[PDB]
Amino acid sequence: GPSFWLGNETLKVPLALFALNRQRLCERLRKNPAVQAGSIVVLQGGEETQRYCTDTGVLFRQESFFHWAFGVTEPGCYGVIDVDTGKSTLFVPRLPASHATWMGKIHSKEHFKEKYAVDDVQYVDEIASVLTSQKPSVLLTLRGVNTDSGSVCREASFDGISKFEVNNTILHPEIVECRVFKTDMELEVLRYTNKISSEAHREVMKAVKVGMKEYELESLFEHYCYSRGGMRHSSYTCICGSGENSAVLHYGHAGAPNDRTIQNGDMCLFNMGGEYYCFASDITCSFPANGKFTADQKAVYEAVLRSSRAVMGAMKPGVWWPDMHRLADRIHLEELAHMGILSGSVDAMVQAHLGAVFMPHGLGHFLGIDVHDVGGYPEGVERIDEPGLRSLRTARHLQPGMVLTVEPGIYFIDHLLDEALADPARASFLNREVLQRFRGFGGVRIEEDVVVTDSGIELLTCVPRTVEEIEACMAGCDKAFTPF
């Protein structure tokens, strides 16, 4: 069958990937006792957008559920799936003649049918007529709440949909559940996104020099990913935190835009991941700007390396993700105590939620077509109302086929440290005089992407991780990849 490919050494992604997703969705819907025979799934793709009121086009990136089902890159499409037969129909815009001048070839419907390996292709303006002739019992549309954004998924609509019976409740939990479990074809894509992003992280580690701006490495990362990987998009805005900025979890956005000069003695925390054909990667590397860990940097870094590998070593089916988060907290506390930042009973520190002062985010999250992938909190799975754990993006137990980030970190965040020092239940553990030295340190995060297997995990990421490996990487002369 056909494949998506951006040539050179980029990955060929078979369109059969999306056919399998459609089949899996139908199989799941058929088993749902509420689903009527003759149902049709109706999804609406993303549309082209512009900046504000201008004609400045925004580069189009497909809506994630639509992509998962169809792999379609063009704006303005719809797609439907007959549940009982699995038959797929793509609806594409009927373009005006002037499109050939301004935008490119006006492809035939047959071109799209071949390209996407769907059963039929029709024009968008005929959607009501086509669906009417199919005589469906009900249209199943997409509406639900994303548990990371709190946004409501946009339900498909078209002129004449009011003449059909529409259900917008059944589909969302079923298609979400399908997305939670990655097929072998999807895993091949995620191995590739991890491979390219890993290579780009290594190039960044080799290129970092004291005196550079953070954004110079953002630029280099994205250039490697696009030119060598065919990754036109990143999975999220690059986080290139140097010095104290490494304590800011989503640093790099427009309000704090990777604009600090990297200084001798800084730690760097670079959390970046290219996106290929709407599939994510999400990797964090932490390292000294000057290529040599100080004693304090080594101690904090190796604490996080310890939790990283302890969590990865414990992960397997049946493990409760919140238990892995707590495992990381306990390790961090043990190590911070060894360093002299903390004193006293680690059991008591855990009871006082001290771990969350140093790791005020979730241990990690599902990853797929979105970096914070869907399905972390389906109905019946509750968010734990405690510091740190409440920021977990899933409280599920692990099962084969899930893809997770494993991203423990330790940070020195003044307002959290100050709150802890004011609370007698936590202050007794904190040694102010030692902690003082780490004010402004920033933090360390080590983030791998892994797949749960029948017996454990498969690690997708491949970057240097021990202190020696990182120092050796940064000292290498190779000068492969030299723009200009």
Report the partner that residue 226 touches, choosing among its own copies, Na ion, ligand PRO, none (CB closer than 5 to 8 A by kind): its own copies
Identify the residue among 3, 50, 108, 345 touching its own copies (CB under 8 A): 50
Work out the burial of residue 221: count CB atoms within 10 Å of its CB; fewer than 13 is exposed, 13-18 middle, 19 or more buried: buried
Among residues 116 and 287, whose Cβ is nearest to ligand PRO? Answer: 287
Among residues 256 and 337, whose Cβ is nearest to ligand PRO? Answer: 256
Q: How far is the CB of 166 from Mn ion (least distance, A)?
A: 36
251 binds its own copies (CB under 8 A): yes
Written as six digits, the tokens of 295 are 């004693």
362 binds ligand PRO (CB under 6 A): yes
Identify the residue among 365, 396, 426, 465 touching ligand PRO (CB under 6 A): 365
Stretch 5-44: interaction string toward its own copies, x if CB under 8 A = -xxx------------------------------------
Kindly report each contact of residues 306-311 with a partner whose C-beta sits within 8 Å and lies 24 or more positions away, as own/partner.
306/331, 306/335, 307/331, 307/332, 307/408, 308/406, 308/408, 308/446, 308/448, 308/465, 311/363, 311/406, 311/408
Binding region for ligand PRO (CB under 6 A) out of 162-170, 194-202, 330-338, 359-367: 359-367
**Beta-carbon count within 10 A of 481 CB:** 16
Written as six digits, the tokens of 305 are 């390396």
Among residues 71 and 443, whose Cβ is nearest to ligand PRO? Answer: 443
Binding region for ligand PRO (CB under 6 A) out of 81-89, 131-139, 285-293, 360-368: 360-368
Stretch 413-442: interaction string toward its own copies, x if CB under 8 A = xxxx--------------------------
Identify the residue among 135, 184, 254, 264 touching its own copies (CB under 8 A): 254
396: amino acid identity, one letter: R
Beta-sheet strand order (sheet of 166-167): 120-123, 88-92, 78-82, 40-44, 139-140, 166-167
Written as six digits, the tokens of 439 are 């004010």
123 binds its own copies (CB under 8 A): no
Identify the residue among 146, 281, 284, 307 touching its own copies (CB under 8 A): 146
HSE at residue 191, side-chain half, CA atoms within 13 A, is 12
Identify the residue among 222, 266, 329, 370 touching Na ion (CB under 5 A): 222
Residues belonging to the chain = 484
Pairing of strands 267-272, 403-406: unpaired
Written as six digits, the tokens of 63 are 């809506």
- 266 and 272 Cβ atoms separated by less than 8 Å: no
Report the partner that residue 308 touches, choosing among Mn ion, its own copies, Na ion, none (CB closer than 5 to 8 A by kind): none
| Residue 293 to residue 92: CA distance in whole angstroms | 55
Q: How many residues bind its own copies (CB under 8 A)?
A: 75
Among residues 25 and 331, whose Cβ is nearest to ligand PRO? Answer: 331
Residues 232-251 that bind ligand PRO (CB under 6 A): 249-250
Q: How far is the CB of 356 from ligand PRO (least distance, A)?
A: 13
393 binds ligand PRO (CB under 6 A): yes
Helix (H/G/I), strand (E/B), else coil: 387: coil
